A paper describes a structure:
The Commander complex is required for endosomal recycling of diverse transmembrane cargos and is mutated in Ritscher-Schinzel syndrome. It comprises two sub-assemblies: Retriever composed of VPS35L, VPS26C, and VPS29; and the CCC complex which contains twelve subunits: COMMD1-COMMD10 and the coiled-coil domain-containing (CCDC) proteins CCDC22 and CCDC93.
Purified BS3-crosslinked CCC dodecameric complex was vitrified on graphene-oxide coated grids for single particle cryoEM. To partially address this issue, we re-processed the data in RELION4.0. Several rounds of 3D particle classification with and without alignment combined with 3D refinement yielded a reconstruction with overall resolution of 3.5 Å. The HN domains of the COMMD proteins and the CH domain of CCDC93 were better resolved in this map, albeit at lower resolution than the central core of COMM domains, facilitating further refinement. Although the complex studied by cryoEM includes the full-length CCDC proteins, no density is observed for the CH domain of CCDC22 or the C-terminal coiled-coil domains of either protein, indicating significant flexibility in their relative orientation to the COMMD ring. In this structure, the CCDC22 and CCDC93 linkers make extensive contacts with the central COMM domain ring and the peripheral HN domains, while the CCDC93 CH domain is partly stabilized by direct interactions with the COMMD ring via the HN domain of COMMD4. Two PxxR sequences in CCDC22 that form similar turn structures, 145PHLR148 and 199PVGR202, bind the HN domains of COMMD5 and COMMD3, respectively. The extensive interactions mediated by the linker regions of the CCDC proteins appears to enhance the stability of the COMMD ring and likely explains why only tetrameric sub-complexes are isolated when expressing the COMMD proteins alone in E. coli.
Numbering used by the authors:
A (entry chain A): 1 to 187
B (entry chain E): 53 to 224
C (entry chain G): 135 to 200
D (entry chain N): 128 to 209
E (entry chain T): 121 to 294
F (entry chain J): 72 to 202
G (entry chain H): 5 to 183
H (entry chain C): 1 to 195
Amino acid sequence: MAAGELEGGKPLSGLLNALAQDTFHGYPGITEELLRSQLYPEVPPEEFRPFLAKMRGILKSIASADMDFNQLEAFLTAQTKKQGGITSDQAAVISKFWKSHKTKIRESLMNQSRWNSGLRGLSWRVDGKSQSRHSAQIHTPVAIIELELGKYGQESEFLCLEFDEVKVNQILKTLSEVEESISTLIS
Amino acid sequence: KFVVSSLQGEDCREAVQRLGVSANLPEEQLGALLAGMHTLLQQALRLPPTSLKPDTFRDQLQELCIPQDLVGDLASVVFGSQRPLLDSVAQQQGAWLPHVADFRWRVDVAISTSALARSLQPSVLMQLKLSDGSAYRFEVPTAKFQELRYSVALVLKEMADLEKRCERRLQD
Amino acid sequence: IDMEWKFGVTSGSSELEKVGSIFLQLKLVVKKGNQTENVYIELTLPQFYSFLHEMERVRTSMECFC
Amino acid sequence: IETKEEMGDYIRSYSVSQFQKTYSLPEDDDFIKRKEKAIKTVVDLSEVYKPRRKYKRHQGAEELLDEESRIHATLLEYGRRY
Amino acid sequence: GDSAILLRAIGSQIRDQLALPWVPPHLRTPKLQHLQGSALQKPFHASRLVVPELSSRGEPREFQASPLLLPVPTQVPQPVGRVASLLEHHALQLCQQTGRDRPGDEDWVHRTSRLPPQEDTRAQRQRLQKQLTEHLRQSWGLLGAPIQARDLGELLQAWGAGAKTGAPKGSRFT
Amino acid sequence: LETISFILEQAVYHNVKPAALQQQLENIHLRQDKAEAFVNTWSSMGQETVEKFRQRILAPCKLETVGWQLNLQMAHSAQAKLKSPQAVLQLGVNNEDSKSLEKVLVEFSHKELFDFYNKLETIQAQLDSLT
Amino acid sequence: EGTPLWRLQKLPAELGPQLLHKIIDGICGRAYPVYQDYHTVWESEEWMHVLEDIAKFFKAIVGKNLPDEEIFQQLNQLNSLHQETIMKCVKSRKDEIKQALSREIVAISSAQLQDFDWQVKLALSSDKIAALRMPLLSLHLDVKENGEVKPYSIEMSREELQNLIQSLEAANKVVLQLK
Amino acid sequence: MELSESVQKGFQMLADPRSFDSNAFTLLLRAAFQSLLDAQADEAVLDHPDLKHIDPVVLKHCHAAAATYILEAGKHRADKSTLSTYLEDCKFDRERIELFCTEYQNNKNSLEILLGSIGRSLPHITDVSWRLEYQIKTNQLHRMYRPAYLVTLSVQNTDSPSYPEISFSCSMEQLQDLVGKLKDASKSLERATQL
Amino acid sequence: MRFRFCGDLDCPDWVLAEISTLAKMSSVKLRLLCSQVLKELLGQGIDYEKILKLTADAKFESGDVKATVAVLSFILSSAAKHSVDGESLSSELQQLGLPKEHAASLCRCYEEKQSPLQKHLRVCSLRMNRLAGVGWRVDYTLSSSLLQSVEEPMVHLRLEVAAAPGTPAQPVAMSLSADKFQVLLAELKQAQTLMSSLG
Amino acid sequence: MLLELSEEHKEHLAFLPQVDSAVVAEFGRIAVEFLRRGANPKIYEGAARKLNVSSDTVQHGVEGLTYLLTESSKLMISELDFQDSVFVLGFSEELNKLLLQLYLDNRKEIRTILSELAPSLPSYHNLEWRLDVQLASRSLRQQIKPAVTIKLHLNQNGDHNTKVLQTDPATLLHLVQQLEQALEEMKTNHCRRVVRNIK
Amino acid sequence: LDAKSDVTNQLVDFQWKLGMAVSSDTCRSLKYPYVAVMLKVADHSGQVKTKCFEMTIPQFQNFYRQFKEIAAVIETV
Amino acid sequence: KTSSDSISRMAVPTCLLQMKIQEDPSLCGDKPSISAVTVELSKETLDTMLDGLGRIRDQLSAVASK
C-alpha cells in the first residue's frame, strides 16, 4: 500500500541513516529496525521487505565513484522515474545527505578494506649515553622509536628500535628515495 | 613368529613383505591370514592359563579345516617362555591417565618480606613430572599439605579394605 | 612500577636432608606496553650482594650531571 | 520387579539420556549456573569443619615397616573417629 | 548410464575393500597401508621452473645449451615436486595461452583477427593509468602539505651544547 | 584512603603496639578522634591481619583444592579376570599469573601410592625440626 | 674494500660459472651450491659472506637496471676472465632474477599463498538421511604467515562455489585490464 | 585434456626422422619416464652418447613436452585410443605410436600410484583399546557402585608424522549409543554395496 | 521379525517400552504435542510449558514426558530417514501395540509436513565447514626498492568460514600474485565443470 | 561408616536444643536453600531483624545442620544408624524425628549435587557420521576412494569439544567388533559376581 | 653474551614498495595511493623477525619529517 | 633523555637494567629457554629499591651480630 513513500519522510531518512550505520560504520549493536516496526505501525501486511532491497540497491549504487552532485541527479531521476520513485525534493534531500557523510563513508570503506598492519601513531625519543657497567665514559647518542601497529578490529602491538648516526642517515636516504620515486611518477 | 614380534610393538613390515615376495603369495591372502592369527592369539592371551586349559584349547581347535601339526606351534607360543613377556606388555595396556615419573621438593623458612618485617612461615615448594611429558611446579602451604597427606592415608586405607573384600566376597 | 621480595632460608630438599642455603626471591611488575607482566627471579647471597653494590654504583653515576 | 528397583532401571535412564542430548528442560537450564554456587558452598563448609592436625603421635614410633600398621598410626595424628 | 554405472562401480569397490579384513599397522604391506591408512600421503608443492625456449637470439642460448641448465623435469630432488611443478607450469602456460592466440567463438575470435601485439590495447588502458597517476599526483599538497618548516632543523647547529657534567659524584646510602 | 591504607600497611609491617600509634600519629597534627578510631580498630583485628599476611604467597602457582576417586579395574582389551584396585587424584593448581585455574589428573596403584606416602612422610619429618 | 665481489678472486676462472649459476638457481627457488664442492677455496664463515654478497649484488644490479658501462666499470679490478663471466651471466638470465624480485615484492604483506590442492567427493548418506547425494568440493590451502606455513581447509557445495567463482571473475575483469 | 602450443611444437618436432631415429626416440622416451619416476635421478638421463648429435635446446624442449604429455595422460586416465588418435594427429607412423603405447603400458601402474599419493586428509584412526572399571567413591561421595568405560583411540595425522591418542570416558548407555551409531554406519555401507 | 522405519533392523527396546507410555494419552493432545516437537525439529522453536500443560491432565512426571518427547523425535526422524510413508508407518506402529486411533492421529500431521522436514534434514546434515562470504581487493604496484619499476597487479582475498551453527566465523586472509590467482580460478572452473554433471 | 560425631562440631549443635522445633524446621529449610540457591549471610541480617537473634550463632547452627545433612546423605546410612547417632545430642524425640525425616526427604537431590565434585574427565556426548567417496583430485580425475567421516563430541568440565576424524570400512568393522566385546563382559560370571557381592 | 649496545632490537634491513588500491568487492573505484614497508629485525637471541605494515601519504610524510627532526636533534648533541 | 617528540629538550637521568634468566628445561618443554629482560627505571624507583635492599642488608647484619 502507498504508506510512507508519498506521506512520511521521517521513517525513510531514519532507515537510510540506520542502514549507513549498520553497513558502513560498523555499529550494528542497536538499530532503529526493531523500534520503527512497533512505533510506526505502517508495516504492509505482505509487501514490506522488497522495498528495503531497493533501499540497499540505491545505497550501494551511489557508493561506486562518488561523482559530482550535478551527475548524481541524472542517475537518481533515471532510476527513480518509475513507480514509487523518490521526489525531486526528496532527491535533493538525499543528495545533500551524501555530503553529510561522504568522508566518513569513504574512510570506513578504506578502514573496512585493510589487509596488513597499519600505522596508528609514531612516538620517538633521542638520548645521550653516559656509561655502563664496565665502560666508564661514553657520549655517542642514540634514538628510540616505538611503532603503534595493529590490524583493524584487533589489539595494537608495539615495536621498539635502536639507532645511531649512520643508520639514521641510511634510513633518511631511503625515505628520500621513496619521496623522489613518488615525485617522478606523476608525469 | 612375525605376528608375535608385532605384539610387543616392534615394526616388522619389511620382513613380511620379503616373505610374501619369496613365497609368491598375493597380499589379499597374506593379510587375511595375518589378521586371523593376530585376532586368534589376542583373544587367546586375554585369559590366564587357569581359565584356558590345553585340553579345551585343542578340542575347540577341532581338526575340521585345521591341521594337526600347527596346534603344537600354537600351544608352544601361548604356553612357551614368551608368555611372561606377553603378559608383562599386556599388563602395560591397562592404563588411561599419566603416572608420576618423579617427585622433588624444597622446604623454605620465610624470614622477611616486603609486606612484613619478620614472617617466619614455613613453606614447601613442589615439582612434579608425568609420563605424558608434563612438568608442574607450585607452592603448597602447610595446611594444604596436611590435607593432601590425610587424603593419601585415607585412600591407602580404603584400598586395603577393597583388597581384603576382593578375596572374601568372591570366593563363596 | 612495583616490586616485591622475600628473604628466607632453606632447611632441606629432596636429595639433602639438612642444608641452610639462603636465597632471595623477587617479583618485578614491568609495564610491557599497554599490558602488564611479572618477572620472578631467585638470587643467591653473593649475587644479591653484588646486585646491591651495582645499584649503589648506578646511584652514584646517576646523580653526576644533576 | 524387586531387583529392578536396584539395577533394572536401565531403559528409563537410556531414554532420559537420549532426550537430554538435544534438549534442556527449563528447570535444569538455570541448574547449570546453580551448580557452581552449590560446589562453592560445600567446599567452604568442608573448610569450616576441615579435619585439622591438632593432635600428635608420641615420638618414637618409627620401628614399623608395614603397609597396614603405619597408615593406621598416621590417621591417629588427626584424631578422626574410625 | 553414468548416474547408475558410477553407483555400480562404487558398490563393487566398497565390496572389494570390505573383503580385506583389518590388520595391525605393524604388519601392513604398502598396498594395505594405502587402503587402511594415510601414512604415505605427501603434500602438493610447486617450485619455480625454467625451460629452454625455441628462440636463438644469442647469448642466452649458450646457457640454454650448457650442462648448467639441467633438464626441466630433474631440476628438483623429489619426484612429487617434479610432477607438481610440471603440472602448474603447464597450467600457467595454458592460461597465458588463453589470453593469446585462441581459436574461440564467433565473437571472441573477432579481436584476434587484427590485434597488434599489446599495442592497440595501450590506448584504452592509458586512460586508466592516467587516473592512477593523477590520483597519485594529488595528496602531494592537497592536505597537510606544505610541510616547509626549515626552522627547527638547522638552528640547533649554531648554538651547540653549552653545559656539561663535572667530576664523579656520589653520596652515602640513606 | 590511600594514606590510611599506607599507615595501616606500615603498622602491620612493624607489628606495633597500639601505644606506638597513639603516640606517633598525633605528632603529625592529627586530631584525637582520628587517633582513637585508628587505635581501637588496630586493637580489634590487628593480629588477624598479620596472620593473613603470614600465609601470603609470592610464587605464581599455588595448590588450592584436592580431590580423589577410587575405582576397581576388572578387565581390558589385552587381559581379563582382574581384581586390581586403582586410584585417581586431582590437584587444583591456581595459575595466579593468568587469574585462572588448571587441573592435573594423576593415576596410582598401591605401590606408587605407598611410595608417594613415604615421600610425604619424609617431607613431614623435615617440617618437624622447627618445633 | 672495493666491490663486494672482491672475495671471488680466490676461485679460479674455471669454477666460476658453476658457482654463479647455481647461486642464481638458488635465488629463483631451487637449491644452492653445497660446501663440499668448493670448500678448499673458502672458509664456511666467509663462504656465507661471499654467497650473500653475490646474491645481493645480482639483485641490486637487476632491479636498478644499470647500463652496460656502469656494470662493466664496477668489475674493473676483478680477474681478467671473471668479468666477462659475470657480464654474460647477467645477460643470460636477467629475466629469471626479475621474476624472483617481483615475486618477493608480494612478500610485503601479512601472509602469502604458497600452494593448494582440491578434492571432489560425492556424499551418499548420513545419519540424518540415506538419500543425500551431495557433491562437495574440499579446498586445501597452505598460506605462509609470519615465518611459518599454516594449512587451511574449506568445504563448499555448488552454490558457495558458484558465488566464489563469480566474485573471483569480477576481480579478474579488473586484473586483466590492469595489465 | 587441453594442451599448450609449446608441447604441440615439441611433438611436431619429435616426428621428424631426421631429428630423431627409432633408437633416439626410444631413448628420449625412456629418459623422460626415468626422470618422472626415479627419486635418485641426475643429468645422466641425457648423458647417453647416442643422443649426442642434436642441439640440446630441442632435445630438452621435447623432453619436457613428453613428460608433460605423460603427466596429463596419467591424470586424465587416458587409454590406447586417445593417445593413438592424438599421436596420429601429430603426423606419426605405426612404429612410433606402437612404441609409445608399449612404454606407457610398461610402467603405467607406478604412474597411477604416484599421482594418487598427493594431498592431505583428515586424521585416520587405526584401532581402539578399552578398560572396564567399577566406580566406588569420590572425596564428597561415599557409595556409588557404577561401572564406567575408558576408551582410547589410536590416530595418525598425515599433517604430522606422529601417533597421537584421543581418550574419553563413557558409561554403558553412552557406549550402547556409540555402538548403535557405528552399526548404523556399517549398515549404510552394506546398503551401498548391495546397490 | 523386523521393521523398516528403523532402517530394516529390529526395533530398539527403549522405543518399544516408551511407545506404550505415549499410548496413555488423548489423540487430540497428541496432534498438538507431535506438532510442537515437529516444529522444534523444523527450527521454529519449542515451548516446554505448552507440552507440560497439554500433558498436565495425565500427571506424567519427568521420566514419562522425557521418554515421550524422545520417542516422538526419534521415530519421526527415523521414518523420514528412509522416506517412509504414512500408510506403512501406521501399520508398523500397529504392530508395535499403538492403537489404530493414535496411529491415524499422528500420521495426520506426520504425512503433511514430511517435505519441509526432509529438506531441512538435508540442509542440516553433517558438514565440517562452509564459506559464508568472500571479499577481494586489487592492487597495482608502481615502484619498489627491490625493483625500480614493476607495473604489475596483485590480488587480496578474504574467506569467511562458519565451522558450526551459532559459532563465530574465523576469517582467512592471503595475498596472491596474478599467476596464482589465474591458475586458482581456472582450477575452480574445472572443478565446477566436473561437479555439475552429478544432477 | 557410622556418624561418630566430632566434639567441636557437636558444640555448634547446642543452639538448636535450646530452640523449639518450629524454628528448627525453618533452619532445615534454610539449609536446603543454602545447598540449592546458595548461601547469603545477608539472611543473617534478615533473621536478626525479624527475630532479634544474634547472627553469629545462627550461622553456626545452620552450617552445622547443613554439614550433618551432607555427611549423612554422603553415605546413605540406614535410619536406625542415624537414630543411634543423634541419640548423643540430648535432643527431643520430636526434634530427632524431624531431623531424620528432613534428612530422609532430601538425599537424592543432595547426592546429585555432590556428584559434581569428583575429578572432571572427558566424556562422550554425541557422535555424527557421514559417508563420502573421493572422485577427483588435482592430479587424478577418475578415482574411487570411499571413506567414513566422523565428528566426535566430548565434554570436559562443562565445555563442548569437537574432533574431526576419518576411517575406512574394515577399520569401522573392527571398531564395532571390539566395542561389542567391551559391553559383553558385563554379562559374564566375573562381572556379575563383582557387581552382586558388593551390594 | 652480554653487550650494552644491543638492548631491545636492531633492524638489519629496510625494504618498501609503492602501490595503489584499484578496486574492491564493496567499491569498484577505491583508487587511493598507499606505501608499505617491511622490517626484518634481530633481538638478543640473534634471530631475525619480519614485521610489515602499510601507511598512507600523509602518514609517510609525517614519518619522514619526524626522522628529519631526530637527525637534527641527535646531530646538535 | 635529551629530547623527545612532546618536548624539544631536557636533561634527565635514566637507567636501563638488563638481566639474564635461566629456566629449568623441564618447565618450558624441550627448549633451554634462556631469556633476557630490560627495565627502564627512574630516580624514585631506584631510591625505593635501594632503601629496601639496604633494610634487608641491615637486618642480615643485625642477625649476624646478634
